[PDB]
């Protein structure tokens with residue numbers, strides 16, 4: 001009577017998102033889906049309690065089971081250490097996981113037809129994917145950067161700058177071909193999965209050789225694994241330059257992968273091998289909202305990013321398992337969310353995008369529990385019907 | 387009769403901006419201001435003709451007279467060489483001038499109330515300083531990339547491994563920065579904050595590049611304490627280093643009204659600020675507007691935006707005034723800046739602004755004036771505004 005989801009690593013979070021997260025599982029996921037769930041408590045007091053072990057433990061779990069969905073979690077500073085009496089200034093969980101998993105991060109804003117987009121439109125969303133020794137130079141003299149190949153066949157030495165002025169500062173950066181390659185695979189697969197064109201954008205004219213190598217190693221992997229599958233879906237890859245991008249793009253239908261309100265932005269880390277994926281929101285814990293919540297005040301916090309974390313995650317578990325039932329479900333919910341907002345029912349943040357904050361009458365939007373309630377109602381219906 | 391302006395270095399540019407600059411002069415400056423005008427014609431023909439000499443001179447002039455106003459100039463490339471049979475693909479004027487005067491470039495966007503902004507929280511303006519010359523090359527296969535510092539005083543050289551490539555090849559690059567260059571950045575930066583009475587913010591990835599951005603933060607504080615804290619507190623402003631992630635946070639959540647030191651185009655104003663805090667060069671941040679200019683050539687109606695260009699004149703003129711204690715000029719410059727904003731805030735604008743409000747597809751002709759009409763309306767409100775302050 002319920003769907004078999006399968007293996008999902010979930011990660012609990014902090015403050016206001018910890019609440020929405022629970023609200024989602026309760027009203028939107030568990031009433032409908034059975035999962036073999038590898039839950040990991042990543043909330044600040046638990047991370048401290050276990051010496052950030054829970055984090056490493058979770059990351060390994062995702063590596064194992066391919067699918068991870070993550071609630072937003074407190075990264076620590078002074079005030080935090082002071083607040084929870086933390087033993088240490090724990091390294092961002094995103095950082096720790098990203099480190100054990102690799103891959104490249106894709107960021108997509110969810111588009112609602114009644115919600116202002118920067119460009120008037122933009123019917124379909126653009127999907128953005130983003131991609132050293134430094135020292136002091138006491139006084140004058142040459143800083144040269146020099147390359148000797150393994151076989152000692154040559155030696156190239158380029159001068160970085162000659163200091164006759166005084167001292168300064170200097171640095172050296174590198175980048176292996178492998179990493180560029182992983183960036184490419186991920187970039188093309190992303191374009192495949194979402195059946196959309198891919199673009200690349202570089203300096204290329206300034207940092208010629210560096211950004212050149214990117215142009216190249218993309219082309220090559222395209223022309224030897226992807227030129228084929230791509231046109232098998234009437235969909236291209238192409239290069240371009242940053243300002244010529246923003247050119248034909250800020251006058252575009254939108255809806256392509258481009259390689260280089262917060263409640264609506266969705267990040268996803270897509271690993272090299274295409275099989276492993278972690279989804280989360282792009283926003284934080286929404287502390288301001290949670291302080292209010294604590295104070296007994298009413299809140300209007302956008303659960304969409306967090307929802308899409310779930311769906312995109314579930315979507316990818318379905319894909320892997322070859323699970324048409326589940327696949328349908330994830331999609332069905334992604335629909336209901338956009339549907340419900342387009343229907344006019346929405347949280348305060350969205351309402352502000354439409355009317356501007358000074359203009360928002362309480363009856364223009366719904367509070368956190370009201371909006372979550374409404375999606376619950378609309379999901380229940382939409383599923384009952386089709 | 388007219389206000390005595392003083393020494394001002396004028397540079398004339400190309401294409402649409404050339405047409406507009408002549409209108410700004412004719413209609414808005416000259417009628418009210420006499421000026422000891424060192425003009426230099428930075429047209430492309432003339433730059434060609436004189437063997438980019440006129441450029442150099444203009445820079446040298448600005449050096450000597452402290453105040454410049456630049457019209458947008460063509461930067462050549464292959465296509466341009468053909469169009470103009472150029473003797474040579476001459477370097478970017480700004481490039482030439484900036485490498486003679488030094489200092490720090492500063493963009494401020496001009497904000498009208500009726501113009502959908504980037505963030506509606508930004509009710510007051512945000513001014514951004516930016517600091518290029520990095521050597522980069524391709525590792526074809528395995529080997530070591532090392533970066534070596536040999537002191538000029540004969541002390542043992544110092545070698546850092548940048549990466550030892552075993553599995554494959556890749557890319558590499560050195561980057562550098564002189565103390566002088568950073569000192570300059572800091573000064574220019576504190577100069578401009580005091581100038582504009584707004585507070586100053588430096589951002590870095592200092593945590594991540596301990597030594598490289600470490601130097602900046604330091605050099606900035608060390609300069610800030612040694613000679614600006616006094617003047618800063620004695621004006622209710624402050625300096626402060628921050629990290630980029632904190633810095634965009636506070637920015638996106640702010641009221642605007644601050645200068646930030648960082649390591650629509652007809653409303654963007656570029657200002658080169660020399661460290662001495664005595665020389666300034668003003669210019670619109672946009673280019674020569676060929677697209678519009680070729681429309682103008684073929685007899686068609688244009689609606690190009692003069693504000694950017696006008697503010698070149700006004701910061702230049704304003705700085706001149708401030709230098710010379712010219713209370714009369716000072717007023718005028720402001721008076722004109724306001725009239726600008728005002729006129730647009732009154733509905734009278736160019737097509738590009740009209741499309742900021744009504745959406746590019748929904749822009750009807752009656753929403754906006756064309757270049758020449760709008761330029762007149764500026765002329766009209768200026769006269770009127772000026773007549774009122776008397």
Ligand SMILES: NC(=O)C1=CN([C@@H]2O[C@H](COP(=O)(O)OP(=O)(O)OC[C@H]3O[C@@H](n4cnc5c(N)ncnc54)[C@H](OP(=O)(O)O)[C@@H]3O)[C@@H](O)[C@H]2O)C=CC1
Pocket residue numbers: 071072073074075076094262263264280281282283284285286287288289300301302303304305349
């Ligand atoms: N683990 C993770 O993935 C991340 C964690 N964080 C953590 O978040 C904590 C504090 O977050 P902070 O950086 O202050 O800001 P957040 O990114 O948490 O959100 C700050 C502001 O953005 C708006 N906002 C963001 N998300 C939503 C939403 N879903 N619905 C409605 N409004 C939203 C609200 O604006 P308004 O005030 O106008 O209502 C909110 O006050 C920090 O401790 C940080 O470490 C941050 C980012 C990612």
Ligand SMILES: NC(=O)C1=CN([C@@H]2O[C@H](COP(=O)(O)OP(=O)(O)OC[C@H]3O[C@@H](n4cnc5c(N)ncnc54)[C@H](OP(=O)(O)O)[C@@H]3O)[C@@H](O)[C@H]2O)C=CC1
Pocket residue numbers: 457458459460461462480651652669670671672673674675676677678689690691692694738
């Ligand atoms: N000397 C200088 O400081 C600079 C010079 N240039 C030079 O300009 C030439 C061509 O410039 P280009 O690349 O077209 O860049 P431009 O800055 O001239 O502008 C390109 C587009 O931006 C919009 N735009 C810019 N300024 C205005 C304005 N004042 N009013 C209305 N719309 C505006 C127009 O778009 P739309 O067509 O949609 O109206 C315009 O076609 C080159 O040779 C280049 O080197 C460029 C930048 C700076």
Ligand SMILES: CN1C(=O)/C(=C\c2ccc(=O)[nH]c2)NC1=S
Pocket residue numbers: 461478480481482484485
């Ligand atoms: C405005 N502008 C430039 O500055 C430019 C190139 C440049 C500038 C300074 C320098 O030191 N080297 C190169 N081209 C255009 S247009």
